[PDB]
Amino acid sequence: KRDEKHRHVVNVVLELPTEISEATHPVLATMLSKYTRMSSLFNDKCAFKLDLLRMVAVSRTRR
Amino acid sequence: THCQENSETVALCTPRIVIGNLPDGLAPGPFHELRTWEIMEHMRLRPPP
Amino acid sequence: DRQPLNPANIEARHHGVSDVPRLGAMDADEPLFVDDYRATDDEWTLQKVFYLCLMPAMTNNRACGLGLNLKTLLVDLFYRPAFLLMPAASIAAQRQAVGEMLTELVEDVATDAHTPLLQACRELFLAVQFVGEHVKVLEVRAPLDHAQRQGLPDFISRQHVLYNGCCVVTAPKTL
Amino acid sequence: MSLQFIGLQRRDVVALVNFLRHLTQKPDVDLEAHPKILKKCGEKRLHRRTVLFNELMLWLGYYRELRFHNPDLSSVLEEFEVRCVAVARRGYTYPFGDRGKARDHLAVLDRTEFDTDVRHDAEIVERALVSAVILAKMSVRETLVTAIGQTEPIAFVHLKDTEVQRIEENLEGVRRNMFCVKPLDLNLDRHANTALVNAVNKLVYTGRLIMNVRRSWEELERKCLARIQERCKLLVKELRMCLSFDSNYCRNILKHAVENGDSADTLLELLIEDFDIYVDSFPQS
């Protein structure tokens, strides 16, 4: 299920608190479609964490 | 000097317009600077302001 | 590694791009993630002077090299909801809200009465946009010039360079 | 290989994809040689950012098609090796006006080994050609220009002009189309001359063909590289005013350089990978 895939993205591999929601975070709403296309790299939980961290970094620049 | 113009080698001559066109092994740096010390002393500016 | 590095297909990078494999393939001796060949000759000369003679003279040979374990430091230093949730149009509360180690890191070195601790830390997190890599020891096999190649034509010099590291004065007691 | 445009119809992407798939069997291989296909990309019909993205996608597909279609050289290089060996054999047992400079030029000509990378084959085949033409002009007993600094021109020695205009039309035709290689050996060379002249004419024809296909490949790839850097710099400039997540993300794609070939290849695969992400910043239709 794509909802099950996105729940496994937001709260299992990336481990977000439920305050950080999909419907409120638009960069995460774009990045779910990126994250669902890899069946690997689910053992290094910090990798996707740093990926979302630098993506919300590139969301809020001036340049 | 020797130069090349049209698939050949031809000599070329021209006057040194000033004294500065002497090469380094003819009139080096300290020679020119002592010469300017001479010009300063002749122009009553031996202490430069 | 001990294998020679022939092509331009080993070295590659993407930058400011959502790139999961280059964060996954850290601590690996294969890829050697490099940005772009920016070092030209005069900057290479200045770089060699600064890290060959200007540094060890003035420190009197007391520096060292370190590589921060950057992924764990960055996940324990910026994975906070004050960083993930950000608006783009009470000092004890925000010093609690930033962290427990970061609040003793940018408390005076970049914070004044004009901007608080929480404000400049957003701009500091804005540089995680361009993430580095981990530290790598690269050895440089290089023969000599065309002058003294004739004496011992089989000898190849071996240098040792640090990549994604830092020349350090003193041990980081917070890190 | 998927190549996605944005403000494009179905018939136009059909025309562009069977243009890029059928380029090697079309004469005059150049984009501006067939400029109706370039105006199908749609300048002045569309907005600026979208047509600039479409032009850069077309130039990326052109560069990938060029570097993949990969002009073959090994068979003509092998027969060029055996022709250098034949001219070396014919120059051993020949009497000259002077022995020393003939031996020197022949020493430059033989032991000629090409590197694996295609960049330095051109200067080595050029020094082989100038040595062969020096042996040609001295072996027919006529003067060469001995002025220091100017090299002697690579030209055929004592030919009938119908074969010369045959060489001009063949070499100009391969200045148009350079992927289908056709080594057309000079069977129209007259006999009863010196055999060294005949061997050096066939050698210098193959050398002219080699240096010219390398010249055409260099000028076309350099023109495409300059145009794609021009499109990337214009898109970075044009996208700079608007600000969003997708806009700055598409900016962070094209900050990579394009001066290397493999840099352009990773630019294309990255720009085709997350194409649905930044597509909101580009206006459609």
Side-chain angles (χ1 to χ4, degrees), chain A, chain B, chain C, chain D residues 1-84 86-285:
Chain A
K1 174 52 170 143
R2 292 93 68 212
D3 189 299
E4 185 274 340
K5 206 94 80 183
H6 288 339
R7 288 277 296 98
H8 204 105
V9 160
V10 63
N11 206 2
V12 187
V13 55
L14 281 94
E15 189 33 78
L16 273 299
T18 63
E19 175 49 66
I20 314 300
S21 89
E22 169 266 0
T24 46
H25 215 61
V27 64
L28 193 41
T30 45
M31 207 77 41
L32 259 40
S33 296
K34 173 65 176 65
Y35 287 159
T36 178
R37 279 173 283 182
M38 286 77 65
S39 88
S40 166
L41 310 99
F42 285 127
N43 317 333
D44 36 15
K45 292 315 193 54
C46 61
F48 282 97
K49 274 207 181 192
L50 268 298
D51 205 297
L52 178 51
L53 193 64
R54 66 200 281 267
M55 285 322 278
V56 69
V58 303
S59 70
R60 289 306 178 85
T61 66
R62 193 253 185 186
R63 192 81 38 85
Chain B
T1 186
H2 272 314
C3 54
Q4 292 162 172
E5 302 301 315
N6 305 117
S7 187
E8 56 91 21
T9 298
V10 64
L12 179 58
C13 55
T14 180
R16 299 181 160 98
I17 302 192
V18 300
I19 183 174
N21 318 323
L22 294 191
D24 187 308
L26 280 303
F31 177 72
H32 295 307
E33 294 178 22
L34 267 298
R35 188 155 160 275
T36 56
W37 269 110
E38 284 280 4
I39 305 292
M40 279 187 279
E41 267 184 11
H42 186 223
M43 285 320 141
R44 76 189 150 120
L45 307 182
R46 156 75 194 193
Chain C
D1 211 10
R2 78 173 183 257
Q3 260 281 333
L5 194 147
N6 29 352
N9 205 11
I10 294 299
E11 50 274 47
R13 260 176 62 189
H14 311 263
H15 210 199
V17 177
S18 198
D19 194 302
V20 61
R22 83 181 294 271
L23 308 189
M26 314 188 59
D27 296 332
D29 279 3
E30 184 265 307
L32 176 53
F33 292 134
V34 302
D35 195 329
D36 275 326
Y37 288 84
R38 299 307 90 215
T40 70
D41 47 68
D42 178 277
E43 297 95 300
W44 195 250
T45 319
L46 298 198
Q47 172 80 274
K48 280 166 61 172
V49 164
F50 205 100
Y51 290 165
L52 259 76
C53 47
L54 189 55
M55 189 53 50
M58 299 312 139
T59 185
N60 218 19
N61 193 22
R62 278 190 182 84
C64 201
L66 53 77
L68 312 173
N69 192 259
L70 194 158
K71 54 202 297 300
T72 61
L73 191 48
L74 266 291
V75 76
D76 308 329
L77 264 289
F78 276 132
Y79 210 84
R80 304 305 179 88
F83 299 132
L84 274 78
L85 175 49
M86 273 205 49
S90 88
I91 184 58
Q94 55 208 287
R95 83 175 70 247
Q96 187 275 299
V98 54
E100 69 273 15
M101 161 185 296
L102 200 41
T103 184
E104 302 264 39
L105 189 63
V106 208
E107 50 93 7
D108 55 347
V109 309
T111 305
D112 52 13
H114 309 333
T115 66
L117 205 150
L118 180 49
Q119 170 59 43
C121 203
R122 318 294 187 92
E123 273 296 340
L124 180 58
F125 154 76
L126 261 174
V128 189
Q129 168 177 3
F130 283 162
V131 58
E133 295 85 61
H134 272 184
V135 70
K136 276 82 141 174
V137 167
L138 312 184
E139 69 96 11
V140 177
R141 279 165 193 162
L144 267 299
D145 56 356
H146 292 89
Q148 46 193 332
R149 193 179 174 88
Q150 197 179 11
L152 292 180
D154 58 344
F155 153 73
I156 289 181
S157 72
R158 263 173 310 176
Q159 218 181 341
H160 282 266
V161 57
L162 206 68
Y163 194 30
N164 298 60
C166 164
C167 200
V168 60
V169 166
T170 184
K173 302 151 300 312
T174 55
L175 310 179
Chain D
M1 186 60 244
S2 65
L3 267 297
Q4 272 45 52
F5 304 91
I6 32 175
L8 205 66
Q9 309 328 290
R10 179 51 197 279
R11 37 156 163 85
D12 308 63
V13 72
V14 165
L16 257 62
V17 78
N18 63 1
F19 156 72
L20 301 170
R21 284 278 188 164
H22 308 160
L23 195 46
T24 185
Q25 66 269 49
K26 280 200 308 283
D28 317 298
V29 289
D30 179 275
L31 286 171
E32 293 80 10
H34 287 58
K36 173 184 160 144
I37 300 162
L38 315 177
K39 294 314 298 303
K40 178 151 299 173
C41 168
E43 187 164 61
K44 191 261 180 183
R45 181 218 307 153
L46 205 42
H47 295 286
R48 293 287 305 101
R49 286 176 307 275
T50 166
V51 77
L52 188 38
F53 182 77
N54 268 21
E55 293 157 70
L56 187 142
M57 276 273 148
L58 170 143
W59 281 96
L60 275 170
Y62 189 65
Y63 195 94
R64 170 159 298 196
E65 191 268 346
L66 260 292
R67 182 203 69 257
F68 162 70
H69 275 84
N70 216 327
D72 51 338
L73 77 166
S74 177
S75 65
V76 62
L77 196 69
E78 172 266 0
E79 66 88 28
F80 200 84
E81 172 266 0
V82 75
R83 279 220 168 89
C84 295
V87 168
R89 288 185 292 112
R90 208 154 307 263
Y92 293 148
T93 81
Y94 189 81
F96 288 85
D98 58 76
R99 200 50 178 82
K101 193 50 77 168
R103 172 176 68 256
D104 274 314
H105 279 97
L106 204 169
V108 187
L109 184 128
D110 74 328
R111 54 100 177 172
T112 292
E113 297 77 21
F114 297 91
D115 56 338
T116 60
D117 53 303
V118 308
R119 179 49 156 150
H120 292 284
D121 298 65
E123 276 84 350
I124 299 193
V125 75
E126 272 323 287
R127 73 198 67 188
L129 281 187
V130 302
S131 167
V133 165
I134 287 314
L135 266 72
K137 297 275 196 45
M138 182 167 59
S139 47
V140 77
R141 203 190 154 271
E142 70 183 1
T143 183
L144 59 93
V145 170
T146 73
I148 177 167
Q150 175 175 355
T151 182
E152 301 303 276
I154 297 303
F156 290 84
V157 287
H158 206 179
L159 266 290
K160 178 55 202 52
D161 262 8
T162 178
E163 290 88 358
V164 188
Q165 53 87 21
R166 192 261 194 188
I167 289 319
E168 303 151 3
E169 67 89 30
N170 178 79
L171 270 295
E172 182 47 40
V174 65
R175 292 296 57 56
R176 307 309 92 202
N177 185 20
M178 63 184 190
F179 310 128
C180 46
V181 301
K182 292 182 183 284
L184 318 182
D185 264 355
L186 274 296
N187 44 359
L188 302 153
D189 163 63
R190 187 201 99 100
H191 199 264
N193 293 29
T194 295
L196 188 62
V197 187
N198 301 321
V200 77
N201 287 132
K202 297 171 185 173
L203 178 68
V204 80
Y205 162 69
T206 47
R208 280 195 58 168
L209 193 84
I210 279 294
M211 93 195 162
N212 279 316
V213 295
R214 284 311 164 224
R215 255 51 160 167
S216 274
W217 167 263
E218 290 162 290
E219 57 84 21
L220 201 140
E221 196 214 337
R222 260 75 200 172
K223 203 275 171 174
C224 172
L225 218 49
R227 289 276 80 81
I228 187 176
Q229 205 273 354
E230 203 278 342
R231 294 322 190 275
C232 173
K233 179 54 71 143
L234 286 180
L235 205 152
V236 163
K237 175 55 213 82
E238 188 38 66
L239 172 146
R240 178 57 158 82
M241 182 47 189
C242 76
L243 280 185
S244 88
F245 162 69
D246 294 330
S247 66
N248 309 336
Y249 183 67
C250 177
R251 182 185 295 112
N252 304 140
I253 311 292
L254 321 174
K255 199 53 67 64
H256 304 145
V258 74
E259 309 312 280
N260 185 278
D262 291 330
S263 82
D265 312 334
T266 180
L267 170 70
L268 173 59
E269 64 89 31
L270 196 70
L271 208 57
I272 204 64
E273 181 256 355
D274 46 11
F275 169 66
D276 214 343
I277 302 302
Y278 52 88
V279 68
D280 293 331
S281 275
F282 281 148
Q284 292 80 0
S285 74

mmCIF file with all atom_site columns, all heavy atoms in Angstrom, chain D residues 191-209:
data_model
loop_
_atom_site.group_PDB
_atom_site.id
_atom_site.type_symbol
_atom_site.label_atom_id
_atom_site.label_alt_id
_atom_site.label_comp_id
_atom_site.label_asym_id
_atom_site.label_entity_id
_atom_site.label_seq_id
_atom_site.pdbx_PDB_ins_code
_atom_site.Cartn_x
_atom_site.Cartn_y
_atom_site.Cartn_z
_atom_site.occupancy
_atom_site.B_iso_or_equiv
_atom_site.pdbx_formal_charge
_atom_site.auth_seq_id
_atom_site.auth_comp_id
_atom_site.auth_asym_id
_atom_site.auth_atom_id
_atom_site.pdbx_PDB_model_num
ATOM 1   N N   . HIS D 1 191 ? 50.689 4.096  -62.686 1.00 0.00 ? 191 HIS D N   1
ATOM 2   C CA  . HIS D 1 191 ? 51.916 3.348  -62.481 1.00 0.00 ? 191 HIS D CA  1
ATOM 3   C C   . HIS D 1 191 ? 53.030 4.056  -63.261 1.00 0.00 ? 191 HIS D C   1
ATOM 4   O O   . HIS D 1 191 ? 52.856 5.187  -63.722 1.00 0.00 ? 191 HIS D O   1
ATOM 5   C CB  . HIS D 1 191 ? 51.676 1.886  -62.871 1.00 0.00 ? 191 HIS D CB  1
ATOM 6   C CG  . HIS D 1 191 ? 52.677 0.922  -62.308 1.00 0.00 ? 191 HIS D CG  1
ATOM 7   N ND1 . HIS D 1 191 ? 53.783 0.495  -63.011 1.00 0.00 ? 191 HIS D ND1 1
ATOM 8   C CD2 . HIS D 1 191 ? 52.746 0.319  -61.097 1.00 0.00 ? 191 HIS D CD2 1
ATOM 9   C CE1 . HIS D 1 191 ? 54.483 -0.337 -62.262 1.00 0.00 ? 191 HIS D CE1 1
ATOM 10  N NE2 . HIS D 1 191 ? 53.875 -0.461 -61.096 1.00 0.00 ? 191 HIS D NE2 1
ATOM 11  N N   . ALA D 1 192 ? 54.204 3.425  -63.353 1.00 0.00 ? 192 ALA D N   1
ATOM 12  C CA  . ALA D 1 192 ? 55.447 3.848  -64.008 1.00 0.00 ? 192 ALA D CA  1
ATOM 13  C C   . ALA D 1 192 ? 56.109 5.052  -63.342 1.00 0.00 ? 192 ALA D C   1
ATOM 14  O O   . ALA D 1 192 ? 57.155 5.505  -63.822 1.00 0.00 ? 192 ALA D O   1
ATOM 15  C CB  . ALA D 1 192 ? 55.277 4.137  -65.510 1.00 0.00 ? 192 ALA D CB  1
ATOM 16  N N   . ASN D 1 193 ? 55.548 5.581  -62.257 1.00 0.00 ? 193 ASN D N   1
ATOM 17  C CA  . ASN D 1 193 ? 56.229 6.566  -61.429 1.00 0.00 ? 193 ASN D CA  1
ATOM 18  C C   . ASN D 1 193 ? 57.126 5.839  -60.432 1.00 0.00 ? 193 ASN D C   1
ATOM 19  O O   . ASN D 1 193 ? 57.337 4.625  -60.512 1.00 0.00 ? 193 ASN D O   1
ATOM 20  C CB  . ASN D 1 193 ? 55.216 7.462  -60.720 1.00 0.00 ? 193 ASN D CB  1
ATOM 21  C CG  . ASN D 1 193 ? 54.454 8.349  -61.676 1.00 0.00 ? 193 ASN D CG  1
ATOM 22  O OD1 . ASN D 1 193 ? 54.253 8.003  -62.838 1.00 0.00 ? 193 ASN D OD1 1
ATOM 23  N ND2 . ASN D 1 193 ? 54.023 9.504  -61.187 1.00 0.00 ? 193 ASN D ND2 1
ATOM 24  N N   . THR D 1 194 ? 57.666 6.577  -59.470 1.00 0.00 ? 194 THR D N   1
ATOM 25  C CA  . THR D 1 194 ? 58.397 5.961  -58.375 1.00 0.00 ? 194 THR D CA  1
ATOM 26  C C   . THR D 1 194 ? 57.394 5.334  -57.411 1.00 0.00 ? 194 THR D C   1
ATOM 27  O O   . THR D 1 194 ? 56.368 5.944  -57.096 1.00 0.00 ? 194 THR D O   1
ATOM 28  C CB  . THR D 1 194 ? 59.268 7.008  -57.675 1.00 0.00 ? 194 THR D CB  1
ATOM 29  O OG1 . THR D 1 194 ? 60.269 7.480  -58.586 1.00 0.00 ? 194 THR D OG1 1
ATOM 30  C CG2 . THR D 1 194 ? 59.957 6.444  -56.431 1.00 0.00 ? 194 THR D CG2 1
ATOM 31  N N   . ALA D 1 195 ? 57.676 4.099  -56.977 1.00 0.00 ? 195 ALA D N   1
ATOM 32  C CA  . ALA D 1 195 ? 56.780 3.392  -56.066 1.00 0.00 ? 195 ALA D CA  1
ATOM 33  C C   . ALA D 1 195 ? 56.696 4.067  -54.704 1.00 0.00 ? 195 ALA D C   1
ATOM 34  O O   . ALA D 1 195 ? 55.677 3.935  -54.009 1.00 0.00 ? 195 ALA D O   1
ATOM 35  C CB  . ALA D 1 195 ? 57.238 1.943  -55.907 1.00 0.00 ? 195 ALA D CB  1
ATOM 36  N N   . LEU D 1 196 ? 57.756 4.783  -54.307 1.00 0.00 ? 196 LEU D N   1
ATOM 37  C CA  . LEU D 1 196 ? 57.720 5.555  -53.070 1.00 0.00 ? 196 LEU D CA  1
ATOM 38  C C   . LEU D 1 196 ? 56.679 6.659  -53.143 1.00 0.00 ? 196 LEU D C   1
ATOM 39  O O   . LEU D 1 196 ? 55.992 6.933  -52.154 1.00 0.00 ? 196 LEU D O   1
ATOM 40  C CB  . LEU D 1 196 ? 59.098 6.140  -52.772 1.00 0.00 ? 196 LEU D CB  1
ATOM 41  C CG  . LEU D 1 196 ? 59.231 6.815  -51.409 1.00 0.00 ? 196 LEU D CG  1
ATOM 42  C CD1 . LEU D 1 196 ? 58.995 5.810  -50.297 1.00 0.00 ? 196 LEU D CD1 1
ATOM 43  C CD2 . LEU D 1 196 ? 60.593 7.459  -51.265 1.00 0.00 ? 196 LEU D CD2 1
ATOM 44  N N   . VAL D 1 197 ? 56.526 7.274  -54.321 1.00 0.00 ? 197 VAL D N   1
ATOM 45  C CA  . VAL D 1 197 ? 55.491 8.286  -54.516 1.00 0.00 ? 197 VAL D CA  1
ATOM 46  C C   . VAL D 1 197 ? 54.103 7.673  -54.377 1.00 0.00 ? 197 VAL D C   1
ATOM 47  O O   . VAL D 1 197 ? 53.213 8.268  -53.765 1.00 0.00 ? 197 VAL D O   1
ATOM 48  C CB  . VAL D 1 197 ? 55.677 8.986  -55.878 1.00 0.00 ? 197 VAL D CB  1
ATOM 49  C CG1 . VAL D 1 197 ? 54.708 10.147 -56.026 1.00 0.00 ? 197 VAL D CG1 1
ATOM 50  C CG2 . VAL D 1 197 ? 57.094 9.493  -56.007 1.00 0.00 ? 197 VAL D CG2 1
ATOM 51  N N   . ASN D 1 198 ? 53.913 6.453  -54.879 1.00 0.00 ? 198 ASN D N   1
ATOM 52  C CA  . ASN D 1 198 ? 52.597 5.825  -54.814 1.00 0.00 ? 198 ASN D CA  1
ATOM 53  C C   . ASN D 1 198 ? 52.243 5.447  -53.379 1.00 0.00 ? 198 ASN D C   1
ATOM 54  O O   . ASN D 1 198 ? 51.116 5.696  -52.910 1.00 0.00 ? 198 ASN D O   1
ATOM 55  C CB  . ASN D 1 198 ? 52.583 4.597  -55.723 1.00 0.00 ? 198 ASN D CB  1
ATOM 56  C CG  . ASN D 1 198 ? 52.900 4.943  -57.166 1.00 0.00 ? 198 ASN D CG  1
ATOM 57  O OD1 . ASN D 1 198 ? 52.457 5.968  -57.681 1.00 0.00 ? 198 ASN D OD1 1
ATOM 58  N ND2 . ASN D 1 198 ? 53.679 4.094  -57.820 1.00 0.00 ? 198 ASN D ND2 1
ATOM 59  N N   . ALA D 1 199 ? 53.219 4.883  -52.658 1.00 0.00 ? 199 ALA D N   1
ATOM 60  C CA  . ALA D 1 199 ? 53.013 4.532  -51.258 1.00 0.00 ? 199 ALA D CA  1
ATOM 61  C C   . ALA D 1 199 ? 52.775 5.771  -50.405 1.00 0.00 ? 199 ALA D C   1
ATOM 62  O O   . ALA D 1 199 ? 51.909 5.766  -49.521 1.00 0.00 ? 199 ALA D O   1
ATOM 63  C CB  . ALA D 1 199 ? 54.209 3.742  -50.732 1.00 0.00 ? 199 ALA D CB  1
ATOM 64  N N   . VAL D 1 200 ? 53.489 6.862  -50.693 1.00 0.00 ? 200 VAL D N   1
ATOM 65  C CA  . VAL D 1 200 ? 53.307 8.050  -49.874 1.00 0.00 ? 200 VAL D CA  1
ATOM 66  C C   . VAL D 1 200 ? 52.010 8.768  -50.241 1.00 0.00 ? 200 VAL D C   1
ATOM 67  O O   . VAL D 1 200 ? 51.422 9.434  -49.389 1.00 0.00 ? 200 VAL D O   1
ATOM 68  C CB  . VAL D 1 200 ? 54.537 8.980  -49.962 1.00 0.00 ? 200 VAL D CB  1
ATOM 69  C CG1 . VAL D 1 200 ? 54.577 9.762  -51.250 1.00 0.00 ? 200 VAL D CG1 1
ATOM 70  C CG2 . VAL D 1 200 ? 54.587 9.921  -48.788 1.00 0.00 ? 200 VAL D CG2 1
ATOM 71  N N   . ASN D 1 201 ? 51.493 8.592  -51.466 1.00 0.00 ? 201 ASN D N   1
ATOM 72  C CA  . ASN D 1 201 ? 50.191 9.172  -51.783 1.00 0.00 ? 201 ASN D CA  1
ATOM 73  C C   . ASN D 1 201 ? 49.069 8.445  -51.062 1.00 0.00 ? 201 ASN D C   1
ATOM 74  O O   . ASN D 1 201 ? 48.161 9.091  -50.523 1.00 0.00 ? 201 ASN D O   1
ATOM 75  C CB  . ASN D 1 201 ? 49.915 9.178  -53.285 1.00 0.00 ? 201 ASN D CB  1
ATOM 76  C CG  . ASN D 1 201 ? 50.737 10.205 -54.022 1.00 0.00 ? 201 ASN D CG  1
ATOM 77  O OD1 . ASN D 1 201 ? 51.350 9.916  -55.047 1.00 0.00 ? 201 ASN D OD1 1
ATOM 78  N ND2 . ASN D 1 201 ? 50.797 11.410 -53.470 1.00 0.00 ? 201 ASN D ND2 1
ATOM 79  N N   . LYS D 1 202 ? 49.109 7.110  -51.043 1.00 0.00 ? 202 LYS D N   1
ATOM 80  C CA  . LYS D 1 202 ? 48.089 6.376  -50.295 1.00 0.00 ? 202 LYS D CA  1
ATOM 81  C C   . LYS D 1 202 ? 48.195 6.650  -48.793 1.00 0.00 ? 202 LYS D C   1
ATOM 82  O O   . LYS D 1 202 ? 47.171 6.838  -48.111 1.00 0.00 ? 202 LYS D O   1
ATOM 83  C CB  . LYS D 1 202 ? 48.191 4.883  -50.597 1.00 0.00 ? 202 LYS D CB  1
ATOM 84  C CG  . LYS D 1 202 ? 47.916 4.554  -52.056 1.00 0.00 ? 202 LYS D CG  1
ATOM 85  C CD  . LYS D 1 202 ? 48.229 3.105  -52.385 1.00 0.00 ? 202 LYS D CD  1
ATOM 86  C CE  . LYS D 1 202 ? 48.064 2.845  -53.874 1.00 0.00 ? 202 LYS D CE  1
ATOM 87  N NZ  . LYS D 1 202 ? 48.512 1.480  -54.261 1.00 0.00 ? 202 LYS D NZ  1
ATOM 88  N N   . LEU D 1 203 ? 49.429 6.749  -48.284 1.00 0.00 ? 203 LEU D N   1
ATOM 89  C CA  . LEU D 1 203 ? 49.648 7.071  -46.877 1.00 0.00 ? 203 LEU D CA  1
ATOM 90  C C   . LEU D 1 203 ? 49.141 8.466  -46.533 1.00 0.00 ? 203 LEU D C   1
ATOM 91  O O   . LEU D 1 203 ? 48.484 8.655  -45.504 1.00 0.00 ? 203 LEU D O   1
ATOM 92  C CB  . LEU D 1 203 ? 51.134 6.955  -46.548 1.00 0.00 ? 203 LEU D CB  1
ATOM 93  C CG  . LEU D 1 203 ? 51.534 7.301  -45.117 1.00 0.00 ? 203 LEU D CG  1
ATOM 94  C CD1 . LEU D 1 203 ? 50.992 6.260  -44.166 1.00 0.00 ? 203 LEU D CD1 1
ATOM 95  C CD2 . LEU D 1 203 ? 53.034 7.410  -44.986 1.00 0.00 ? 203 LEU D CD2 1
ATOM 96  N N   . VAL D 1 204 ? 49.405 9.451  -47.394 1.00 0.00 ? 204 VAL D N   1
ATOM 97  C CA  . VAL D 1 204 ? 48.988 10.810 -47.088 1.00 0.00 ? 204 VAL D CA  1
ATOM 98  C C   . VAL D 1 204 ? 47.491 10.997 -47.300 1.00 0.00 ? 204 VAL D C   1
ATOM 99  O O   . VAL D 1 204 ? 46.892 11.847 -46.633 1.00 0.00 ? 204 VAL D O   1
ATOM 100 C CB  . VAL D 1 204 ? 49.824 11.830 -47.888 1.00 0.00 ? 204 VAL D CB  1
ATOM 101 C CG1 . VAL D 1 204 ? 49.345 11.986 -49.326 1.00 0.00 ? 204 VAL D CG1 1
ATOM 102 C CG2 . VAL D 1 204 ? 49.858 13.170 -47.182 1.00 0.00 ? 204 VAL D CG2 1
ATOM 103 N N   . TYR D 1 205 ? 46.850 10.183 -48.149 1.00 0.00 ? 205 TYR D N   1
ATOM 104 C CA  . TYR D 1 205 ? 45.395 10.238 -48.238 1.00 0.00 ? 205 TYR D CA  1
ATOM 105 C C   . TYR D 1 205 ? 44.753 9.711  -46.965 1.00 0.00 ? 205 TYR D C   1
ATOM 106 O O   . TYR D 1 205 ? 43.803 10.315 -46.444 1.00 0.00 ? 205 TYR D O   1
ATOM 107 C CB  . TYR D 1 205 ? 44.888 9.444  -49.440 1.00 0.00 ? 205 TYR D CB  1
ATOM 108 C CG  . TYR D 1 205 ? 43.418 9.105  -49.325 1.00 0.00 ? 205 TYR D CG  1
ATOM 109 C CD1 . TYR D 1 205 ? 42.450 10.101 -49.413 1.00 0.00 ? 205 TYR D CD1 1
ATOM 110 C CD2 . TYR D 1 205 ? 42.997 7.798  -49.112 1.00 0.00 ? 205 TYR D CD2 1
ATOM 111 C CE1 . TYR D 1 205 ? 41.108 9.804  -49.300 1.00 0.00 ? 205 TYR D CE1 1
ATOM 112 C CE2 . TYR D 1 205 ? 41.655 7.493  -48.991 1.00 0.00 ? 205 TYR D CE2 1
ATOM 113 C CZ  . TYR D 1 205 ? 40.715 8.500  -49.091 1.00 0.00 ? 205 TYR D CZ  1
ATOM 114 O OH  . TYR D 1 205 ? 39.377 8.202  -48.979 1.00 0.00 ? 205 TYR D OH  1
ATOM 115 N N   . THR D 1 206 ? 45.256 8.581  -46.457 1.00 0.00 ? 206 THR D N   1
ATOM 116 C CA  . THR D 1 206 ? 44.710 8.047  -45.213 1.00 0.00 ? 206 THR D CA  1
ATOM 117 C C   . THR D 1 206 ? 45.008 8.972  -44.034 1.00 0.00 ? 206 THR D C   1
ATOM 118 O O   . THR D 1 206 ? 44.178 9.119  -43.128 1.00 0.00 ? 206 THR D O   1
ATOM 119 C CB  . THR D 1 206 ? 45.264 6.650  -44.971 1.00 0.00 ? 206 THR D CB  1
ATOM 120 O OG1 . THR D 1 206 ? 46.681 6.663  -45.179 1.00 0.00 ? 206 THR D OG1 1
ATOM 121 C CG2 . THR D 1 206 ? 44.638 5.688  -45.963 1.00 0.00 ? 206 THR D CG2 1
ATOM 122 N N   . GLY D 1 207 ? 46.162 9.644  -44.063 1.00 0.00 ? 207 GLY D N   1
ATOM 123 C CA  . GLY D 1 207 ? 46.470 10.619 -43.030 1.00 0.00 ? 207 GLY D CA  1
ATOM 124 C C   . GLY D 1 207 ? 45.583 11.849 -43.081 1.00 0.00 ? 207 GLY D C   1
ATOM 125 O O   . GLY D 1 207 ? 45.183 12.373 -42.037 1.00 0.00 ? 207 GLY D O   1
ATOM 126 N N   . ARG D 1 208 ? 45.272 12.328 -44.292 1.00 0.00 ? 208 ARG D N   1
ATOM 127 C CA  . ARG D 1 208 ? 44.353 13.453 -44.432 1.00 0.00 ? 208 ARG D CA  1
ATOM 128 C C   . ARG D 1 208 ? 42.959 13.081 -43.952 1.00 0.00 ? 208 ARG D C   1
ATOM 129 O O   . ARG D 1 208 ? 42.303 13.877 -43.270 1.00 0.00 ? 208 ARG D O   1
ATOM 130 C CB  . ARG D 1 208 ? 44.304 13.923 -45.885 1.00 0.00 ? 208 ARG D CB  1
ATOM 131 C CG  . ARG D 1 208 ? 45.470 14.798 -46.288 1.00 0.00 ? 208 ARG D CG  1
ATOM 132 C CD  . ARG D 1 208 ? 45.206 15.524 -47.593 1.00 0.00 ? 208 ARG D CD  1
ATOM 133 N NE  . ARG D 1 208 ? 44.016 16.360 -47.526 1.00 0.00 ? 208 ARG D NE  1
ATOM 134 C CZ  . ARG D 1 208 ? 43.693 17.270 -48.438 1.00 0.00 ? 208 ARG D CZ  1
ATOM 135 N NH1 . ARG D 1 208 ? 44.479 17.473 -49.486 1.00 0.00 ? 208 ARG D NH1 1
ATOM 136 N NH2 . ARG D 1 208 ? 42.588 17.985 -48.299 1.00 0.00 ? 208 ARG D NH2 1
ATOM 137 N N   . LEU D 1 209 ? 42.521 11.853 -44.252 1.00 0.00 ? 209 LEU D N   1
ATOM 138 C CA  . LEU D 1 209 ? 41.224 11.387 -43.770 1.00 0.00 ? 209 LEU D CA  1
ATOM 139 C C   . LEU D 1 209 ? 41.193 11.287 -42.248 1.00 0.00 ? 209 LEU D C   1
ATOM 140 O O   . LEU D 1 209 ? 40.210 11.695 -41.620 1.00 0.00 ? 209 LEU D O   1
ATOM 141 C CB  . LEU D 1 209 ? 40.887 10.039 -44.400 1.00 0.00 ? 209 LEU D CB  1
ATOM 142 C CG  . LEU D 1 209 ? 39.440 9.574  -44.231 1.00 0.00 ? 209 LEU D CG  1
ATOM 143 C CD1 . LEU D 1 209 ? 38.555 10.178 -45.311 1.00 0.00 ? 209 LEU D CD1 1
ATOM 144 C CD2 . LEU D 1 209 ? 39.347 8.057  -44.238 1.00 0.00 ? 209 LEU D CD2 1
#
